[PDB]
A paper describes a structure:
A periplasmic solute-binding protein (Smon0123) captures unsaturated GAG disaccharides with the 1,3-glycoside bond and delivers substrates to an [name] transporter localized in the cytoplasmic membrane. Smon0123 is composed of two major domains (N- and C-domains), and each domain has two small subdomains. Each domain included a parallel and an antiparallel β-sheet surrounded by many α-helices and formed the α/β sandwich structure. All the crystal structures of Smon0123 so far determined include metal ion in its molecule, suggesting that the metal ion contributes to protein folding.
Crystal structures of ligand-free Smon0123 (N-28/C-5) and ligand (CΔ4S or CΔ6S)-bound Smon0123 (N-18/C-5) were also determined by molecular replacement with CΔ0S-bound Smon0123 (N-18/C-5). Generally, the solute-binding protein adopts two conformations during substrate binding, substrate-free open form and substrate-bound closed form, indicating that there is a transitional state (substrate-bound open form) in the conformational change. Compared with the structure of CΔ0S-bound Smon0123 and that of ligand-free Smon0123, the N- and C-domains of ligand-bound Smon0123 were 47° more closed than those of ligand-free Smon0123. Distinct from substrate-free Smon0123 in the open conformation, the binding protein in complex with the substrate adopts the closed conformation by accommodating the substrate at the cleft between the N- and C-domains. Therefore, the closed conformation of substrate-bound Smon0123 is considered to be important for association with the [name] transporter. The substrate specificity of Smon0123 coincided with that of Smon0121-Smon0122(10xHis)/Smon0120-Smon0120 for ATPase activity, indicating that the [name] transporter interacts with substrate-bound Smon0123 (closed form), but not the substrate-free form, and triggers ATP hydrolysis.
Author numbering: 28 to 500
The structure:
Amino acid sequence: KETTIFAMHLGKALDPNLPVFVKAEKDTNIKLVNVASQNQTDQIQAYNLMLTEGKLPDIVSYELSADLENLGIEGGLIPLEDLINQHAPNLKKFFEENPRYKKDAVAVDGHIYMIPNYYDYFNIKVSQGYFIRQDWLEKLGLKEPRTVDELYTTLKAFREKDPNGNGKKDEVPFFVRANNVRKVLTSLVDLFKASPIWYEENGMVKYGPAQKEFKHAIKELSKWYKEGLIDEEIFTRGLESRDYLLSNNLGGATDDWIASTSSYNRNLADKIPGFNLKLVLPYELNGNAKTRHARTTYLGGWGISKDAKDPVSLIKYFDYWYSVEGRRLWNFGIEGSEYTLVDGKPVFTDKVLKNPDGKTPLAVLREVGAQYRLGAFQDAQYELGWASESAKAGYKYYMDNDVVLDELPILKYTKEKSKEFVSIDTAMRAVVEEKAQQWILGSGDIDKEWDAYIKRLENLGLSKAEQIQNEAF
Ligand SMILES: [Ca+2]
């Protein structure tokens, strides 16, 4: 059966002749025909153009789920929940076994309009983590800090005791990597168990920047900033911060993405003798040793349009990607080309792990149509199949110690509540970022100014936004 689809990902329209989709056609007898051409590169433009047709393609795939769900509410996509319950055993069991993932699939009106492209979140939750210069701790006779007060003592010693050995007070004890204010705050306030965004607490949704922990975080950060413990240029350096500070042997500690930050030991070993930037668990504050840095559960998804003539066959195509072999196909490519089975489990080939032109394993996989964002279920075993030893070590450490808290899910709103919420959320963001940056850099006094700042947030609509967020959760 020839089945029309709108599908794009990373600027490329899905080519059904790629090995992954030829295999799935051989297994399912569904042959996709894309309405997006090989010349289109702008998925937002091509999607909107596609929606002006009198007939929609059989399957509609898009990166932004809220747009798919609105198209469902408008009647352009059909509800899927009865189709799944009646005809898609793999999805039916997946939703039963994963109530969190089921939430991502249910739209604001209680219908399912799209199947998300899920990360394997419960197997790898891990994004950012805390790193510290083990070789500096050791040469200074310091324990690994395990609380925020112990970190303070540690960063003070980094700043005052010349661990890079050059007789200059040039050490930058704590730094971040960011290119906007929200990203700076994200990597500073999590240490103090605060949040710059919305979060979940005791089943309710709350606004990070209005909390007592945020006040305490900014006050402490302002104190550490004044004492030279936090990079004087936190808000002015950009994405070059980590490379500049680590490669010049100035930086002592950070909070940053685990896979990339764990690469510096191997890169700087010949250049900085003894260099060991080491991943540690989140520091404890008042009994809390969690981090709110977490991966997300999905990105994008796909649905069936009102114009598909055989939706039952299409829900089975959707279900194929949740079978054992369909999920392995999507994640790993073709057996005998991208991977072999070793004791029942895929092991990538040299074609994937040692591409002679320098291509990454994921880039090689993408070229066969693996990992092509639709409504499939990523497998963390695909990622561990190629990730570096230090990346995998960091993932395992944070996973085994259960330190990562689930992020607030992507919430669902009607179009009108969304506009209302976004207008409020945008206005408050501007206030929080202005005030927190100035407080951290030592302007004014947060104790004297906190109340008026909270009233400004309330005047911008904080209570209404809380009401909308809690309804949506
Ligand atoms: Ca020094």
